[PDB]
């Protein structure tokens, strides 16, 4: 916002989506006049916000606190000799690429 900020995911970012078990998906908050109607339409409760899940490509309303920051230089759990090959995959690259495209966009409010 403006002077003391620093807390709640805000749309446009890049984090972590928890699914079950040790695997996971990365997935970014969208904003809800970013998304369909058909998403929209999803009833919620409070703090719950639309979210893109990579590699699949579908939106989704869930929870603060249960995602994580993605980083860029470190990883260290999904990258370094893999012969997986799967929609995951897919999903770490449009993640990234996400990532370095929203840092990589023209200046507009923030």
Known sequence: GS??????????????????????????????????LNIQGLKHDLGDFPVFFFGSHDYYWVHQGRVFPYVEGDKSFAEGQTSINKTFKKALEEAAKRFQELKASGPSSG
């Open 3 to 36: 002077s003391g900020s620093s807390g709640k995911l805000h749309y446009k970012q890049i984090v972590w989506v928890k699914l079950g078990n040790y695997r996971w998906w990365p997935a970014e908050i969208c904003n809800p006049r970013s998304v369909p």
